[PDB]
Amino acid sequence: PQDLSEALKEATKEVHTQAENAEFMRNFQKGQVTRDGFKLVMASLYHIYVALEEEIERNKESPVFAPVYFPEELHRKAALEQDLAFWYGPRWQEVIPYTPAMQRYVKRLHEVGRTEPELLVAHAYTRYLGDLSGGQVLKKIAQKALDLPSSGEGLAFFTFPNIASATKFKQLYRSRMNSLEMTPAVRQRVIEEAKTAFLLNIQLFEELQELLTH
Ligand code: HEM
C-alpha cells in the first residue's frame, strides 16, 4: 500500500504467524514456559537490544533514521540489565549464554547499522512495535506461569515507563515512519529486511527449543 507502515504490516503478516506458530512460542502462549526457557529468552533480548541500540545511536542524526529516533520512550538495554541481574544473579555478565543463533541476529544488526543504515528502521520496527504490542500479552502469561517471588524484579523489560499510551505512541511511530523519504527500490529492501528480522527471530526460537529439550 501507500503508507510504509501499512506496507510493512501487510508484508510481514505471513512471517508473523510463522513466529506465532514456532514450537517455543506455541508453548509460551499456552502458558507452558519454564524458568530455564524464560531465562534464555531474556538473555537473547539483552544481546539483541545492545546491538540495535548501539547502531541506533550511530545513525540517530541521519536522515534515514532521525524521524524514528525515540531514545527515552523506547530504550530497553537498562531494563534488560536489571532483569538479568535478577534471573542470573550479580555475576550475570559472566554466565549469560551467547549462542550462535543470537550471534547471527546481532551480526545482521551491526551490518545494517554500519553499511546499510537506511534499513535500520526495519529492525527498530520489528522489535519495538512488536514488543510494545505483542509483548504486552506475553507479559501477562509469563508472570502467571513463572510463579516468582514478590521481589519486585525480573520483568522490567515488559514495561515502557516513558510511554503513557501504547496505542497513541504506536500511531505516532507509524506517522514518523511514513515521513521517511526513500526511493521505491529502498522501500522494497526495507520491506524485505523486516521479513529478514522475523526470520532471525524464528531461527532463534528454533535454537532455544533445541537447547531445552535434552
Ligand atoms: C507468539 C507471540 C506473539 C503474539 C501473541 C503477538 C501478538 C501481537 C499482537 C496482538 C499485535 C497487534 C496487532 C495490531 O493490532 O496491529 C502484534 C503486533 C506486532 N507484532 Fe506480534 N506477537 C507475537 C510475536 C511477535 C514477534 C516474534 C515479533 C517479531 C520480533 C512480533 C512483531 C510484531 C510487530 C512488528 C507488530 C506490529 C504490527 C503493525 O505494524 O501494526 N510479534 N503482535
- How far, in Å, CA of 113 to CA of 55, rounded? 5
Among 177, 170, 52, 58, CA closest to 105: 52
- How far, in Å, CA of 114 to CA of 129, rounded? 22
Q: What is the dihedral of CA 171, 179, 194, 47, to 10 degrees?
A: -80
Residue 58: exposed, middle, or buried by beta-carbon count in 10 A (0-12, 13-18, 19+)? middle
- How far, in Å, CA of 80 to CA of 158, rounded? 9
110 carries a ligand binding annotation: no
Q: Is the CB of 198 under 6 A from ligand 1?
A: yes
Closest-lying ligand 1 atom to the alpha carbon of residue 126? 35
For the chain, the straight-line distance linking the first and the last C-alpha, in angstroms and rounded, comes to: 46
Q: Is the CB of 192 under 6 A from ligand 1?
A: no
Q: Which residue has the cell 527471530?
A: 201
Contact (CB, 8 A) for 196 and 9 = no
Q: Which domain holds residue 209?
A: 1-214
Distances (CA, A) of 12 to 63, 158, 199: 25, 23, 10
Technique of determination: X-ray
Give the number of domains in the chain: 1
**Count of CB atoms within 10 A of residue 49's CB?**
25
Instruction: Compute the distance from residue 135 Cα to the ligand 1 centre, in Å.
Output: 8
Resolution (Å) of this entry? 1.7
Stated length of the chain:
214
100's grid cell: 550462535
Instruction: Compute the distance from residue 108 Cα to the ligand 1 centre, in Å.
Output: 21
Interhelix angle 13-21/4-11, rounded to 10 degrees, is 40
Amino acid at 21: N
Task: Find the farthest-apart pair of alpha carbons in the chain and give their distance in angstroms, rounded.
Answer: 52
- How far out from the chain centre does Cα 211 lie? 21
Cα 193-194-198 angle, rounded to 5 deg: 115
22's grid cell: 514456532
Task: Classify residue 67 by its DSSP letter.
Answer: G
132's grid cell: 510494545
Q: Which residues of 137-170 are buried (b: 16+ CB within 10 A; e: fewer)?
A: ebeeebeebeeeeeeeebbbbbebeebeeeeebb
Pocket residue to mutate for ligand 1, from 131, 133, 168, most atoms within 8 A of Cβ: 133
77's grid cell: 538495554
12 phi/psi in degrees, rounded to 5:
-100, 10
**What is the domain-level CATH number for residue 80?**
1.20.910.10
154 phi/psi in degrees, rounded to 5:
110, -20
Contact (CB, 8 A) for 60 and 69 = yes
Q: Is the CB of 20 under 6 A from ligand 1?
A: yes
- How far, in Å, CA of 99 to CA of 31, rounded? 25
